[PDB]
Each structure stands twice: as C-alpha cells, then as structure tokens.
Amino acid sequence: FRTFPGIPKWRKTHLTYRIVNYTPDLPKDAVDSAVEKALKVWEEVTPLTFSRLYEGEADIMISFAVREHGDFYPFDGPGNVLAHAYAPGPGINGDAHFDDDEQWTKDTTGTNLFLVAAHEIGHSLGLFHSANTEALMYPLYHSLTDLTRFRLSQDDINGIQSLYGPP
Ligand SMILES: O=C(O)CNS(=O)(=O)c1ccc(N2CCC(c3ccccc3)CC2)cc1
Ligand SMILES: [Ca+2]
Ligand SMILES: [Ca+2]
Ligand SMILES: [Ca+2]
Ligand SMILES: [Zn+2]
Numbered sequence: 001f002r003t004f005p006g007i008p009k010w011r012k013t014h015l016t017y018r019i020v021n022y023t024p025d026l027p028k029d030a031v032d033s034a035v036e037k038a039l040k041v042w043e044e045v046t047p048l049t050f051s052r053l054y055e056g057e058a059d060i061m062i063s064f065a066v067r068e069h070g071d072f073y074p075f076d077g078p079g080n081v082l083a084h085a086y087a088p089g090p091g092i093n094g095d096a097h098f099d100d101d102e103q104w105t106k107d108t109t110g111t112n113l114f115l116v117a118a119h120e121i122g123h124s125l126g127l128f129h130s131a132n133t134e135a136l137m138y139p140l141y142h143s144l145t146d147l148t149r150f151r152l153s154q155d156d157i158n159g160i161q162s163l164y165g166p167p
C-alpha cells in the first residue's frame with residue numbers, strides 16, 4: 001500500500017458525507033446504494049463511521065460534474081479519468097467528484113459506479129495507490145466478471161488500518 005505524502009488522515013472517527021447532486025444515468029436509489037456500499041466496505045475494517053447530511057458542509061462532499069467544475073483538475077470528456085478525490089482535510093479535501101461524461105452503471109459491463117466510488121473513498125480516507133494488482137487501490141480501472149466476488153485485498157486492509165486501526 002501507499003499513503004499520501006505527509007500522511008494526511010482524519011483525526012476523528014465520525015465522518016459525514018453529502019451527495020450534492022445526481023447523475024442522469026441511474027435512478028437515485030441506485031446511486032445512494034452504490035455509495036453506501038462503498039462507505040460500508042471501509043467501515044467494516046476500521047473504527048470509522050459515516051452519516052449522511054442532506055444540507056450544509058459535510059466532510060466528504062460527493063458530486064457529479066463535467067469538464068471545468070471548480071478545482072484545479074477539470075474532467076476530460078468520455079473515457080480516461082473517470083473520477084477523482086482529495087486526501088483528508090478541510091474544504092475540498094475529502095471530496096469526491098465523478099465525471100458525468102462517463103456512462104455510469106450498476107452492472108459488470110460499463111463503468112461501474114460502486115467500484116469507482118469505493119476506490120475514491122479510499123483516497124478520501126488517506127490511501128494512495130497500490131502496486132498489488134488485486135487491490136482496490138490499484139491505479140488502473142477494471143471491473144469484475146461477478147460483482148458478488150468483490151472484496152478488499154489484504155493490502156487495502158493493511159493500509160487503512162495503518163491509519164485508523166482495526167475495528
Ligand atoms: O482515482 C484515480 O486514481 C484517478 N481516476 S481513474 O478514473 O483513473 C481510476 C478510477 C478507478 C480505478 N479503480 C481501480 C481498480 C478497481 C477495482 C479493484 C478491484 C476489483 C475491481 C475493481 C476499480 C477502481 C482506478 C483509476
Ligand atoms: Ca471536504
Ligand atoms: Ca473522463
Ligand atoms: Ca453521465
Ligand atoms: Zn474535481
């Protein structure tokens with residue numbers, strides 16, 4: 001595993017998130033479902049808990065956007081960068097943005113929202129890229145033949161517990 005430079009981490013175990021807006025591609029229940037499953041993956045292996053805000057500033061602001069969208073890294077149209085997220089801290093730190101020029105899916109065929117969200121939340125928590133080709137935090141996107149076979153690798157677990165400890 002790898003962490004970010006200077007090891008940013010949250011110094012608190014109760015985090016909040018807000019889904020500020022929604023993709024055209026999926027019903028809202030499918031996107032809520034994807035992000036809460038993505039939160040849950042990390043919750044199980046740490047002492048962190050997440051709760052949702054419907055207004056105000058949450059720690060992790062989640063949104064869908066195209067091209068230039070209010071930070072230093074505009075999205076780039078279809079393909080290439082699918083999403084990005086910032087390391088722990090105030091303001092834009094912690095946040096995750098998804099490129100809505102992708103076509104988001106629930107299935108194993110397109111660009112799957114759950115797999116990407118789980119990866120991005122790894123960033124939001126302080127993890128950078130892994131060299132393990134098994135790891136969630138591997139730098140190159142791919143999906144699975146069967147989503148029910150999804151699991152965190154030992155590397156992702158070792159990485160995240162280095163920051164926050166076990167549950
Ligand atoms: O976030 C960045 O770094 C930059 N954005 S990006 O759009 O290039 C990017 C987005 C996602 C991934 N993923 C890595 C592998 C993965 C996975 C892992 C195990 C089993 C199934 C699927 C699913 C997400 C990698 C890069
Ligand atoms: Ca934030
Ligand atoms: Ca893109
Ligand atoms: Ca889209
Ligand atoms: Zn952004």
Ligand SMILES: [Zn+2]
Pocket residue numbers: 119123129137138139
């Ligand atoms: Zn990444």
